Amino acid sequence: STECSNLLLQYGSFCTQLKRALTGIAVEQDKNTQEVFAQVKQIYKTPPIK
Amino acid sequence: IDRLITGRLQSLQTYVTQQLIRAAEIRASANLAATKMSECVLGQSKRVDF
């Protein structure tokens, strides 16, 4: 909708704030995954004899 | 004036909510820093990777 987008431009920078908040949320989840599992430097392997 | 008052009030409330969330995160980091100062500078730590 062109008219509704033009009326949405008359508001503030609200949608450069919700997009900026959700991107910071989404980036933070990868840091949460990296901090828990990637605590080892080298990928160890078990011997064939168990 | 009522329209501008509503818009500026919404912007101020959004700023206050974001500042509250950021202050909670900063308080959690400050609690972690205080625990690290109490346990690692004032003594020796047996906890792994602390």
Short mmCIF file of N, CA and C in Angstrom, two decimals:
data_model
loop_
_atom_site.label_atom_id
_atom_site.label_comp_id
_atom_site.label_asym_id
_atom_site.label_seq_id
_atom_site.Cartn_x
_atom_site.Cartn_y
_atom_site.Cartn_z
N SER A 1 0.85 -1.19 0.00
CA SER A 1 0.00 0.00 0.00
C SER A 1 0.88 1.24 0.00
N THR A 2 0.76 2.06 -1.04
CA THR A 2 1.58 3.26 -1.15
C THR A 2 1.11 4.35 -0.19
N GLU A 3 -0.21 4.55 -0.09
CA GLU A 3 -0.75 5.59 0.77
C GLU A 3 -0.50 5.29 2.24
N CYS A 4 -0.67 4.03 2.64
CA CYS A 4 -0.41 3.66 4.03
C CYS A 4 1.07 3.73 4.37
N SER A 5 1.95 3.40 3.41
CA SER A 5 3.39 3.54 3.65
C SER A 5 3.79 5.01 3.77
N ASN A 6 3.17 5.88 2.96
CA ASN A 6 3.43 7.31 3.07
C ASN A 6 2.93 7.89 4.38
N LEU A 7 1.79 7.39 4.89
CA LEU A 7 1.34 7.82 6.21
C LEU A 7 2.18 7.21 7.32
N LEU A 8 2.79 6.05 7.07
CA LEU A 8 3.69 5.45 8.06
C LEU A 8 5.02 6.19 8.12
N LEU A 9 5.42 6.83 7.01
CA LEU A 9 6.63 7.65 7.03
C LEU A 9 6.47 8.91 7.87
N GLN A 10 5.23 9.36 8.11
CA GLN A 10 5.00 10.55 8.92
C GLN A 10 5.24 10.30 10.40
N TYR A 11 5.32 9.04 10.82
CA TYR A 11 5.65 8.72 12.20
C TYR A 11 7.17 8.80 12.40
N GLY A 12 7.62 8.39 13.57
CA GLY A 12 9.03 8.49 13.91
C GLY A 12 9.84 7.35 13.33
N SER A 13 11.01 7.15 13.93
CA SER A 13 11.86 6.00 13.60
C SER A 13 11.55 4.82 14.52
N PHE A 14 10.27 4.46 14.60
CA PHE A 14 9.86 3.35 15.45
C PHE A 14 10.28 2.01 14.88
N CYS A 15 10.28 1.88 13.55
CA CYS A 15 10.57 0.60 12.91
C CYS A 15 12.02 0.46 12.48
N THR A 16 12.86 1.44 12.77
CA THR A 16 14.30 1.22 12.82
C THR A 16 14.75 0.90 14.23
N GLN A 17 13.82 0.82 15.18
CA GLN A 17 14.06 0.43 16.56
C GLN A 17 13.60 -0.98 16.86
N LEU A 18 12.44 -1.39 16.33
CA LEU A 18 11.99 -2.77 16.50
C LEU A 18 12.82 -3.72 15.65
N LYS A 19 13.26 -3.28 14.47
CA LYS A 19 14.17 -4.09 13.66
C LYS A 19 15.54 -4.18 14.31
N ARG A 20 15.99 -3.10 14.95
CA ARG A 20 17.29 -3.11 15.62
C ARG A 20 17.26 -3.93 16.90
N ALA A 21 16.11 -3.99 17.58
CA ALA A 21 16.01 -4.79 18.80
C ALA A 21 15.96 -6.28 18.49
N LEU A 22 15.19 -6.66 17.46
CA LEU A 22 15.05 -8.08 17.12
C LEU A 22 16.33 -8.64 16.51
N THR A 23 17.09 -7.82 15.79
CA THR A 23 18.39 -8.26 15.29
C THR A 23 19.37 -8.50 16.44
N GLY A 24 19.34 -7.64 17.46
CA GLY A 24 20.16 -7.87 18.63
C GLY A 24 19.71 -9.05 19.46
N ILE A 25 18.41 -9.37 19.42
CA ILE A 25 17.92 -10.60 20.04
C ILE A 25 18.43 -11.82 19.28
N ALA A 26 18.35 -11.78 17.95
CA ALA A 26 18.70 -12.94 17.13
C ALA A 26 20.20 -13.21 17.13
N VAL A 27 21.02 -12.15 17.17
CA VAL A 27 22.47 -12.33 17.27
C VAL A 27 22.85 -12.92 18.62
N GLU A 28 22.12 -12.55 19.68
CA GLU A 28 22.43 -13.00 21.04
C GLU A 28 22.21 -14.50 21.23
N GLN A 29 21.31 -15.11 20.45
CA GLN A 29 21.05 -16.54 20.59
C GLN A 29 22.23 -17.37 20.10
N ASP A 30 22.92 -16.90 19.05
CA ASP A 30 24.12 -17.58 18.58
C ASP A 30 25.25 -17.48 19.59
N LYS A 31 25.34 -16.36 20.31
CA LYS A 31 26.31 -16.24 21.40
C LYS A 31 25.97 -17.19 22.55
N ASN A 32 24.68 -17.38 22.82
CA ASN A 32 24.25 -18.34 23.83
C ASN A 32 24.61 -19.76 23.44
N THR A 33 24.46 -20.10 22.15
CA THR A 33 24.86 -21.42 21.69
C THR A 33 26.37 -21.60 21.70
N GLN A 34 27.12 -20.55 21.35
CA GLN A 34 28.58 -20.61 21.33
C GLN A 34 29.19 -20.71 22.73
N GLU A 35 28.58 -20.07 23.73
CA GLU A 35 29.18 -20.04 25.06
C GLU A 35 29.05 -21.38 25.77
N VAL A 36 28.05 -22.18 25.43
CA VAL A 36 27.76 -23.40 26.17
C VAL A 36 28.49 -24.60 25.58
N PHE A 37 28.41 -24.78 24.26
CA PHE A 37 28.93 -25.99 23.63
C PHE A 37 30.37 -25.85 23.16
N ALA A 38 30.79 -24.66 22.73
CA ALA A 38 32.12 -24.47 22.17
C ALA A 38 33.12 -24.08 23.26
N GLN A 39 33.26 -24.97 24.24
CA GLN A 39 34.23 -24.81 25.32
C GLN A 39 35.48 -25.65 25.11
N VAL A 40 35.59 -26.32 23.97
CA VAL A 40 36.71 -27.21 23.68
C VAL A 40 37.41 -26.71 22.42
N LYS A 41 38.74 -26.73 22.44
CA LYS A 41 39.51 -26.20 21.32
C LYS A 41 39.61 -27.19 20.17
N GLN A 42 39.90 -28.46 20.48
CA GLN A 42 40.13 -29.48 19.46
C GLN A 42 39.06 -30.55 19.55
N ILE A 43 38.56 -30.97 18.39
CA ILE A 43 37.53 -32.00 18.31
C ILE A 43 38.17 -33.36 18.59
N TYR A 44 37.99 -33.85 19.81
CA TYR A 44 38.57 -35.12 20.22
C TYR A 44 37.81 -36.29 19.61
N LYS A 45 38.50 -37.42 19.51
CA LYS A 45 37.93 -38.64 18.95
C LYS A 45 38.19 -39.80 19.90
N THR A 46 37.19 -40.65 20.06
CA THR A 46 37.34 -41.83 20.90
C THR A 46 38.10 -42.93 20.14
N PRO A 47 38.86 -43.77 20.85
CA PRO A 47 39.51 -44.91 20.21
C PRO A 47 38.49 -45.95 19.78
N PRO A 48 38.83 -46.79 18.79
CA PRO A 48 37.91 -47.87 18.39
C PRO A 48 37.64 -48.90 19.48
N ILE A 49 38.61 -49.16 20.35
CA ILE A 49 38.40 -50.09 21.46
C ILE A 49 37.66 -49.35 22.57
N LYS A 50 36.53 -49.91 22.99
CA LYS A 50 35.62 -49.24 23.91
C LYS A 50 35.51 -49.98 25.24
N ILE B 1 -1.79 19.47 18.98
CA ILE B 1 -0.94 19.39 20.16
C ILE B 1 -1.17 18.06 20.88
N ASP B 2 -2.41 17.59 20.92
CA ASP B 2 -2.71 16.29 21.53
C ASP B 2 -2.05 15.15 20.76
N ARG B 3 -2.05 15.23 19.42
CA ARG B 3 -1.38 14.22 18.61
C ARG B 3 0.13 14.21 18.85
N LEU B 4 0.75 15.40 18.89
CA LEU B 4 2.19 15.47 19.14
C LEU B 4 2.55 15.03 20.56
N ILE B 5 1.68 15.32 21.53
CA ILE B 5 1.88 14.90 22.91
C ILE B 5 1.83 13.38 23.02
N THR B 6 0.86 12.75 22.33
CA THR B 6 0.76 11.29 22.32
C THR B 6 1.99 10.64 21.69
N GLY B 7 2.46 11.20 20.57
CA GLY B 7 3.65 10.65 19.93
C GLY B 7 4.92 10.77 20.76
N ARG B 8 5.14 11.95 21.36
CA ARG B 8 6.33 12.15 22.18
C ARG B 8 6.27 11.35 23.48
N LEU B 9 5.07 11.18 24.05
CA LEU B 9 4.91 10.34 25.23
C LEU B 9 5.21 8.87 24.93
N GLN B 10 4.76 8.39 23.76
CA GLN B 10 5.07 7.02 23.36
C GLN B 10 6.57 6.82 23.14
N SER B 11 7.24 7.81 22.53
CA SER B 11 8.69 7.72 22.33
C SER B 11 9.44 7.70 23.66
N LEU B 12 9.02 8.55 24.61
CA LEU B 12 9.66 8.59 25.92
C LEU B 12 9.45 7.29 26.69
N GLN B 13 8.25 6.70 26.59
CA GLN B 13 7.98 5.43 27.27
C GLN B 13 8.79 4.29 26.67
N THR B 14 8.97 4.29 25.34
CA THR B 14 9.82 3.29 24.70
C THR B 14 11.27 3.41 25.16
N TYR B 15 11.77 4.65 25.26
CA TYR B 15 13.13 4.88 25.76
C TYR B 15 13.29 4.40 27.20
N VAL B 16 12.29 4.67 28.05
CA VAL B 16 12.37 4.28 29.46
C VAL B 16 12.35 2.76 29.60
N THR B 17 11.52 2.06 28.81
CA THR B 17 11.48 0.60 28.86
C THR B 17 12.80 -0.03 28.40
N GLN B 18 13.38 0.50 27.32
CA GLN B 18 14.67 -0.02 26.86
C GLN B 18 15.78 0.25 27.87
N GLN B 19 15.74 1.41 28.53
CA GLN B 19 16.73 1.72 29.57
C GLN B 19 16.57 0.80 30.78
N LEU B 20 15.33 0.44 31.12
CA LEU B 20 15.10 -0.49 32.23
C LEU B 20 15.67 -1.88 31.93
N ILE B 21 15.45 -2.37 30.71
CA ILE B 21 15.98 -3.69 30.32
C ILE B 21 17.51 -3.67 30.30
N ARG B 22 18.11 -2.60 29.75
CA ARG B 22 19.56 -2.48 29.72
C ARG B 22 20.15 -2.36 31.13
N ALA B 23 19.44 -1.67 32.03
CA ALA B 23 19.91 -1.54 33.41
C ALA B 23 19.85 -2.87 34.15
N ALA B 24 18.84 -3.70 33.85
CA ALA B 24 18.79 -5.04 34.44
C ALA B 24 19.96 -5.90 33.97
N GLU B 25 20.29 -5.82 32.67
CA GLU B 25 21.45 -6.55 32.14
C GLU B 25 22.76 -6.07 32.76
N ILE B 26 22.91 -4.75 32.92
CA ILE B 26 24.10 -4.18 33.53
C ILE B 26 24.21 -4.58 35.00
N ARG B 27 23.08 -4.66 35.71
CA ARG B 27 23.09 -5.09 37.10
C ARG B 27 23.49 -6.55 37.24
N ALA B 28 23.05 -7.41 36.31
CA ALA B 28 23.49 -8.80 36.32
C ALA B 28 25.00 -8.92 36.08
N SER B 29 25.53 -8.12 35.14
CA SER B 29 26.97 -8.13 34.89
C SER B 29 27.75 -7.59 36.09
N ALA B 30 27.20 -6.60 36.79
CA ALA B 30 27.85 -6.05 37.98
C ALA B 30 27.85 -7.06 39.12
N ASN B 31 26.78 -7.84 39.26
CA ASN B 31 26.76 -8.92 40.25
C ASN B 31 27.80 -9.98 39.94
N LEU B 32 27.96 -10.33 38.66
CA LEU B 32 29.01 -11.27 38.26
C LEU B 32 30.40 -10.72 38.56
N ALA B 33 30.62 -9.43 38.29
CA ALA B 33 31.92 -8.81 38.56
C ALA B 33 32.22 -8.75 40.06
N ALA B 34 31.20 -8.47 40.88
CA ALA B 34 31.38 -8.46 42.33
C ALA B 34 31.69 -9.85 42.87
N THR B 35 31.03 -10.88 42.33
CA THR B 35 31.33 -12.26 42.73
C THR B 35 32.75 -12.65 42.34
N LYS B 36 33.20 -12.25 41.14
CA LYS B 36 34.56 -12.53 40.71
C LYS B 36 35.59 -11.82 41.57
N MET B 37 35.31 -10.57 41.96
CA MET B 37 36.21 -9.83 42.84
C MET B 37 36.27 -10.46 44.23
N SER B 38 35.13 -10.95 44.73
CA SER B 38 35.11 -11.56 46.06
C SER B 38 35.82 -12.90 46.08
N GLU B 39 35.69 -13.69 45.00
CA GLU B 39 36.17 -15.06 45.03
C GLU B 39 37.55 -15.26 44.42
N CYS B 40 38.02 -14.35 43.56
CA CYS B 40 39.29 -14.57 42.87
C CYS B 40 40.38 -13.58 43.24
N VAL B 41 40.03 -12.36 43.64
CA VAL B 41 41.03 -11.41 44.11
C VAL B 41 41.27 -11.57 45.60
N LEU B 42 40.22 -11.80 46.38
CA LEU B 42 40.32 -11.94 47.82
C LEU B 42 40.65 -13.36 48.27
N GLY B 43 40.84 -14.28 47.33
CA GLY B 43 41.17 -15.65 47.69
C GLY B 43 41.51 -16.45 46.45
N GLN B 44 41.67 -17.75 46.64
CA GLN B 44 41.98 -18.67 45.55
C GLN B 44 40.75 -19.50 45.21
N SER B 45 40.49 -19.64 43.91
CA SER B 45 39.27 -20.26 43.42
C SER B 45 39.55 -21.68 42.94
N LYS B 46 38.73 -22.63 43.40
CA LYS B 46 38.80 -24.01 42.95
C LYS B 46 37.83 -24.32 41.82
N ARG B 47 36.99 -23.36 41.43
CA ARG B 47 36.02 -23.59 40.37
C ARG B 47 36.71 -23.57 39.01
N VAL B 48 36.33 -24.52 38.16
CA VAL B 48 36.97 -24.68 36.86
C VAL B 48 36.48 -23.59 35.91
N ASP B 49 37.43 -22.90 35.27
CA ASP B 49 37.21 -21.85 34.26
C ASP B 49 36.44 -20.65 34.80
N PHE B 50 36.38 -20.48 36.12
CA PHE B 50 35.76 -19.28 36.67
C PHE B 50 36.68 -18.08 36.51
#
